[PDB]
Scaffold this active site. Structure first.
Site, PDB file in Angstrom:
ATOM      1  N   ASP A  34       1.928  -8.279 -21.948  1.00 45.66           N
ATOM      2  CA  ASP A  34       2.069  -8.450 -22.539  1.00 45.66           C
ATOM      3  C   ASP A  34       1.828  -8.259 -24.073  1.00 45.66           C
ATOM      4  OD1 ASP A  34       3.920  -9.744 -21.581  1.00 45.66           O
ATOM      5  OD2 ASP A  34       3.307 -12.016 -21.713  1.00 45.66           O
ATOM      6  N   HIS A  65       1.141 -18.930 -23.700  1.00 45.65           N
ATOM      7  CA  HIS A  65       1.175 -18.043 -22.800  1.00 45.65           C
ATOM      8  C   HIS A  65       0.314 -17.242 -22.126  1.00 45.65           C
ATOM      9  CE1 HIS A  65       6.264 -17.738 -21.221  1.00 45.65           C
ATOM     10  NE2 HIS A  65       5.134 -16.835 -21.087  1.00 45.65           N
ATOM     11  N   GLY A 101     -22.892  -5.983  -4.759  1.00 44.53           N
ATOM     12  CA  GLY A 101     -23.507  -6.046  -3.741  1.00 44.53           C
ATOM     13  C   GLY A 101     -21.187  -7.269  -3.553  1.00 44.53           C
ATOM     14  N   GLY A 114     -14.683  -7.354  12.714  1.00 41.95           N
ATOM     15  CA  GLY A 114     -14.875  -7.682  11.715  1.00 41.95           C
ATOM     16  C   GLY A 114     -16.034  -7.672  10.990  1.00 41.95           C
ATOM     17  N   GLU A 170     -22.917  -9.971   8.362  1.00 39.26           N
ATOM     18  CA  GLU A 170     -22.794 -11.323   8.608  1.00 39.26           C
ATOM     19  C   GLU A 170     -23.094 -12.276   9.970  1.00 39.26           C
ATOM     20  OE1 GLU A 170     -19.992 -12.827   5.880  1.00 39.26           O
ATOM     21  OE2 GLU A 170     -21.396 -12.471   4.818  1.00 39.26           O
TER      22      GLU A 170
HETATM   23  C1  LIG Z   1     -16.217  -9.846  -2.998  1.00 42.15           C
HETATM   24  C2  LIG Z   1     -17.322 -10.890  -2.258  1.00 42.15           C
HETATM   25  N1  LIG Z   1     -16.445 -11.619  -0.994  1.00 42.15           N
HETATM   26  C3  LIG Z   1     -17.853 -12.119   0.140  1.00 42.15           C
HETATM   27  C4  LIG Z   1     -19.334 -11.574   0.066  1.00 42.15           C
HETATM   28  C5  LIG Z   1     -19.665 -11.263   0.801  1.00 42.15           C
HETATM   29  N2  LIG Z   1     -20.178 -10.348   2.661  1.00 42.15           N
HETATM   30  C6  LIG Z   1     -20.792  -9.995   2.377  1.00 42.15           C
HETATM   31  S1  LIG Z   1     -21.174  -8.755   3.343  1.00 42.15           S
HETATM   32  C7  LIG Z   1     -19.328  -9.452   4.234  1.00 42.15           C
HETATM   33  C8  LIG Z   1     -18.798  -8.184   5.198  1.00 42.15           C
HETATM   34  C9  LIG Z   1     -18.142  -7.309   5.338  1.00 42.15           C
HETATM   35  O1  LIG Z   1     -17.972  -5.946   6.766  1.00 42.15           O
HETATM   36  P1  LIG Z   1     -17.680  -5.124   6.991  1.00 42.15           P
HETATM   37  O2  LIG Z   1     -17.176  -4.224   5.749  1.00 42.15           O
HETATM   38  O3  LIG Z   1     -16.477  -5.066   8.105  1.00 42.15           O
HETATM   39  O4  LIG Z   1     -18.866  -4.111   7.241  1.00 42.15           O
HETATM   40  P2  LIG Z   1     -19.663  -3.992   8.346  1.00 42.15           P
HETATM   41  O5  LIG Z   1     -20.860  -4.807   8.668  1.00 42.15           O
HETATM   42  O6  LIG Z   1     -18.543  -4.870   9.859  1.00 42.15           O
HETATM   43  O7  LIG Z   1     -19.836  -2.249   8.781  1.00 42.15           O
HETATM   44  C10 LIG Z   1     -19.244 -10.183   3.138  1.00 42.15           C
HETATM   45  C11 LIG Z   1     -17.846 -10.644   3.768  1.00 42.15           C
HETATM   46  C12 LIG Z   1     -19.616 -10.578  -0.655  1.00 42.15           C
HETATM   47  N3  LIG Z   1     -19.937  -9.562  -0.547  1.00 42.15           N
HETATM   48  N4  LIG Z   1     -18.233  -9.697  -1.855  1.00 42.15           N
HETATM   49  C1  LIG Z   2      -2.235  -9.644 -13.740  1.00 44.20           C
HETATM   50  C2  LIG Z   2      -1.604  -9.715 -14.381  1.00 44.20           C
HETATM   51  N1  LIG Z   2      -1.272  -8.569 -15.249  1.00 44.20           N
HETATM   52  C3  LIG Z   2      -0.170  -7.896 -15.815  1.00 44.20           C
HETATM   53  C4  LIG Z   2       0.586  -8.874 -16.214  1.00 44.20           C
HETATM   54  C5  LIG Z   2       1.953  -8.183 -17.140  1.00 44.20           C
HETATM   55  N2  LIG Z   2       2.807  -8.081 -16.341  1.00 44.20           N
HETATM   56  C6  LIG Z   2       3.959  -9.018 -16.887  1.00 44.20           C
HETATM   57  S1  LIG Z   2       5.322  -9.006 -15.843  1.00 44.20           S
HETATM   58  C7  LIG Z   2       4.657  -7.426 -15.225  1.00 44.20           C
HETATM   59  C8  LIG Z   2       5.746  -6.356 -14.268  1.00 44.20           C
HETATM   60  C9  LIG Z   2       6.063  -7.692 -13.180  1.00 44.20           C
HETATM   61  O1  LIG Z   2       6.414  -6.342 -12.136  1.00 44.20           O
HETATM   62  P1  LIG Z   2       7.855  -6.420 -11.340  1.00 44.20           P
HETATM   63  O2  LIG Z   2       7.166  -7.629 -10.366  1.00 44.20           O
HETATM   64  O3  LIG Z   2       8.658  -5.598 -10.301  1.00 44.20           O
HETATM   65  O4  LIG Z   2       9.889  -7.626 -11.999  1.00 44.20           O
HETATM   66  P2  LIG Z   2      10.894  -7.023 -12.249  1.00 44.20           P
HETATM   67  O5  LIG Z   2      10.856  -5.821 -11.792  1.00 44.20           O
HETATM   68  O6  LIG Z   2      11.534  -8.137 -11.567  1.00 44.20           O
HETATM   69  O7  LIG Z   2      10.805  -7.729 -13.905  1.00 44.20           O
HETATM   70  C10 LIG Z   2       3.484  -7.051 -16.107  1.00 44.20           C
HETATM   71  C11 LIG Z   2       2.979  -5.985 -15.204  1.00 44.20           C
HETATM   72  C12 LIG Z   2       0.615 -10.581 -15.945  1.00 44.20           C
HETATM   73  N3  LIG Z   2       1.143 -11.094 -16.085  1.00 44.20           N
HETATM   74  N4  LIG Z   2      -0.588 -10.420 -14.909  1.00 44.20           N
HETATM   75 MG   LIG Z   3     -16.273  -4.413   9.751  1.00 44.22          MG
END
Ligand SMILES: Cc1ncc(C[n+]2csc(CCOP(=O)(O)OP(=O)(O)O)c2C)c(N)n1
Ligand SMILES: Cc1ncc(C[n+]2csc(CCOP(=O)(O)OP(=O)(O)O)c2C)c(N)n1
Ligand SMILES: [Mg+2]
Ligand SMILES: [Mg+2]
EC number: 4.1.1.-
Lengths: 537, 537
Positions: free
Chosen positions: A27, A105, A394, A454, A458
């Protein structure tokens, strides 16, 4: 001649070599995005989400020196916050521009237009909320300088009404001064005499290049420092790629107890450690710590002394201070993998050693937090290879976004450089839709997915079978086609023989198309060292 | 007998009927996560991401009364904020529980462990950092009640060390008071009395139900108010689904000047308005505003007078005060579409009118920001239809996560309750991975995707063929299988005839499996209402 405030920004951006902008329309940023297309060499990525857009700017920033992401009031800016927090934590100059209500809004229903602005104020170096055109140019210049200089995110709130008002074009003829304030003469002298002093008395000095060695410019000053002195040089995981792994004085990656035992010792037996750019984890003697805005020698802190000056000055007297040094041998590099039958199921230990064979100079190597970030530390890189590993922050979805950003900047540096990702099956899920943006632009990364069913990392520390450490199985190979890919290639590898066969293929080694390579691995498999500690831990 | 603080939390949730918990595992929340499995009937969704899970937690609350999302310090929490802000703006009871490092990395590298907490406090009704098990139980009980009672997010930081600490099991036998406090009687009377009086003189009264009529549980009282007075009843967009629409005295969707003309006329001409309203984002002077914590009669505000008891109490006397109201003709429902040959391309306008026919009682309708949130207002809903439309926060992407949540809540209320989602192709992109979670749990929502090749709401406001208004074109009918769906259905409809054959089909109307329906629509097509508002946006 005049230019709109809006075009002004893109023009300055281009002056600092920012050619790709991240973000999502909304917007209050529409009128400003229009300006992107009136400046040549600039492009809008059209990201799949704001969090993902924040992550890409970070990666692009890591490769180009700075980045920009544009979001809209509330909804866009709050979705990016976890990306910007991580840029802040790891020193990545990300300029975050947000289109705001028309100086009038997507609000918490309370009449407060500054809440979001104040929330970001916590993870930024400086914030600007522009309200006057007479002040805008300076303000904008100021945010760009800061982001670039401090290598920290800045919030630049820009009302929809002002992007359209005219500003003197003349302003751009004068570049933004990116030059630092000199240091306190007496404290920079104190520090310099003392280092030279330590150096003259050390028998077994070592250099450690950390995280910020290269973000903070000093990568060049750091390599000069190695040659002049001849001290063994080590990288910590966040600094991997900072030192050319093929330099004779290159001794390894120092992780603490997770290091290759000969590496661990070589650093630990050192009587002086010269440490460049710590966001430090790290017997270990006298440590000279070099930080962008402070030095520390032993237990002493010199607040305010920037490393840049100290390091440009040291280079004229170091060879002399050190001429008493008798080169110490550096730990021999881990030997090649033994020959095994091609049937051999893929194991990470084998793999990480093995990978080094695939890599080439100029590669961009990204590794996701998981067993992936642990294993890459075991890969011997060719010279001129950049490493990306979000060890401090991380945030598991990070790398899908980082890869787009990094690929875009590589493309601007040299279309022949390769972008290689190592991401876990579980992390790919948080930010999967960014593969969509790479395809849209014809970016050709190598996406290797560690399929191990998985979260093994962890699982190795808590609840090996806790339902929360498992995930919905995805058909990884159909991702490319589902996102409208045209020119692509998918591949599965489960054995030693397959890794080799594909990684040694000549067409393979060429970045002609986007590729996905699913890696089949055992649920409880991780780099050796991590299993020993994890078990008994 | 003692229970761990971690299990108390889950027990109290079981007691408030929060049976599904949203979030992602991480560094600081694992032992907590383990307690969920010790409590019978409780379950861990396992989201694809934290934004998603917030969206989901919001979705769940809307249907069930409140919800709970569990995240991890830094990385988990920062990612949920757009979700949580969204709940704040629209009054949705989300208890965000964040697991933080013990009372003593995924940090800003500055040793500030109060930063994220501080960011959450601006989008929270109340906050709590637990530091003592003497009061912990009391803190928890408090936070849950506030979430409930205020229908506003609450932040509970819970240090890893305390989770495993014991508490008298006896505290659970006493229920949290989840009940509103009784009004000050004199004030309550004053209001009732003037309401009664003003009702007795109005020749043309109107009832308007807004967001909070649903949000703040006055749903049932508003209904009986309409039966007992026979005064016309109008809803706003946020409040759609608040009045059972097959009611003979229900006259439409009021949306101001952009409303169906006779809707403007009927409301505008009232000499009295009972606004069983909400969120004051805004004939006569004769307005009665009913609000969760206050009433406003003309210019007179009565602080602390809760509409819930005013309403209940009014029902014991209102019909009497109105025995003399001669009922005005309610505006006409829009007529059914005229039969067209099977082969007519679908148009949005023919579509929202016709949906009213596939729609059934007790359905859950979710419509995303774009043309869908606009078109939904032109649909006639059966009685007891629950609609979800983020009219105020408008974060595109919201719906995919909320669909996940509404569905977990809908399955807990009744396995035969259908959950229907209208999401644009642009929006799906932002939260696509949440379909995975739906598949994991074997949930069976109807996913309608409006394929119109880009952001048509945005295009209709600014830059019709601007590159930022366009999306990378995905193959939507492959998502289910790519995310691993085993049993599902996909369909594509492009004509009136296809729409109908599908929607009238008896086995299709039964929520037997998960289904995805791509709707084939032209780029610049939008509902008559967006076609009128647009001018000015
Ligand atoms: C946004 C976010 N949420 C949660 C965590 C906690 N977390 C750390 S490592 C991990 C798992 C990632 O696993 P994967 O990518 O499969 O790696 P692998 O050890 O299996 O190779 C999670 C959930 C994080 N680091 N960041
Ligand atoms: C997280 C976020 N990013 C951007 C916007 C701004 N935005 C509002 S409507 C819109 C497009 C919606 O697209 P779509 O779901 O394709 O709707 P339609 O084609 O049915 O209008 C965007 C990018 C928002 N409201 N929220
Ligand atoms: Mg994995
Ligand atoms: Mg669309």
């Amino acid at each position: 001649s005049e230019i709109t405030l809006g075009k002004y920004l893109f023009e300055r951006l281009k002056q600092v070599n920012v050619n790709t902008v991240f973000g999502l329309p909304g917007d209050f940023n529409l009128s400003l995005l229009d300006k992107i297309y009136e400046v040549e060499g600039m492009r809008w990525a059209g990201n799949a989400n704001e969090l993902n857009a924040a992550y890409a700017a970070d990666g692009y920033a890591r490769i180009k020196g700075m980045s920009c992401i544009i979001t809209t009031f509330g909804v866009g800016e709050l979705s990016a916050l976890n990306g910007i927090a991580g840029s802040y934590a790891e020193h990545v100059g990300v300029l975050h521009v947000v289109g705001v209500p028309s100086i009038s809004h997507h609000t918490l229903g309370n009449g407060d237009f500054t809440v979001f602005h104040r929330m970001s104020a916590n993870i930024s170096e400086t914030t600007a909320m522009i309200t006057d055109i007479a002040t805008a140019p300076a303000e904008i210049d100021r945010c760009i300088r800061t982001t670039y200089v401090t290598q920290r995110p800045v919030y630049l709130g820009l009302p929809a009404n002002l992007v359209d008002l005219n500003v003197p074009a003349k302003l751009l003829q004068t570049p933004i001064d990116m030059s630092l304030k000199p240091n306190d003469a007496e404290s920079e002298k104190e520090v310099i005499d003392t280092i030279l002093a330590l150096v003259k008395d050390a028998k077994n000095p070592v250099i450690l290049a950390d995280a910020c060695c290269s973000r903070h410019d000093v990568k060049a000053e750091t390599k000069k420092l190695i040659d002049l002195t001849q001290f063994p040089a080590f990288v910590t995981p966040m600094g991997k790629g900072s030192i050319s792994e093929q330099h004779p004085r290159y001794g390894g990656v120092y992780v603490g107890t997770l290091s290759k035992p000969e590496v661990k010792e070589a650093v630990e037996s050192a009587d002086l450690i010269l440490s460049v750019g710590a966001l430090l984890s790290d017997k270990t003697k006298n440590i000279v710590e070099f930080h962008s805005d402070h030095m520390k020698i032993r237990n002493a802190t010199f607040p305010g002394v920037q490393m840049k000056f100290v390091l440009q000055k040291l280079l004229t007297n170091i060879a002399d201070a050190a001429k008493g040094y008798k080169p110490v041998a550096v730990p021999a590099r881990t030997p090649a993998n033994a020959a095994v039958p091609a049937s051999t199921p893929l194991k990470q230990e084998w793999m990480w050693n093995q990978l080094g064979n695939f890599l080439q100079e100029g590669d961009v190597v990204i590794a996701e937090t998981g067993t992936s970030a642990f294993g890459i530390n075991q890969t011997t890189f060719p010279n001129n290879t950049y490493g990306i590993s979000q060890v401090l922050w991380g945030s598991i979805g990070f790398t899908t976004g980082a890869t787009l950003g990094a690929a875009f900047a590589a493309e601007e540096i040299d279309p022949k450089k390769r972008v290689i990702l190592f991401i876990g099956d579980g992390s790919l899920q948080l930010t999967v839709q960014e593969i969509s943006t790479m395809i849209r632009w014809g970016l050709k990364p190598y996406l290797f997915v560690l399929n191990n069913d998985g979260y093994t990392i962890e699982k190795l520390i808590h609840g090996p079978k806790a339902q929360y450490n498992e995930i919905q199985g995805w058909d990884h190979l159909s991702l490319l086609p589902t996102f409208g890919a045209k020119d692509y290639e998918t591949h599965r590898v489960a054995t030693t023989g397959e890794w080799d066969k594909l990684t040694q293929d000549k067409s393979f080694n060429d970045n002609s198309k986007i590729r996905m390579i699913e890696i089949m691995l055992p649920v409880f498999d991780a780099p050796q060292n991590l299993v020993k500690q994890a078990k008994l831990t």
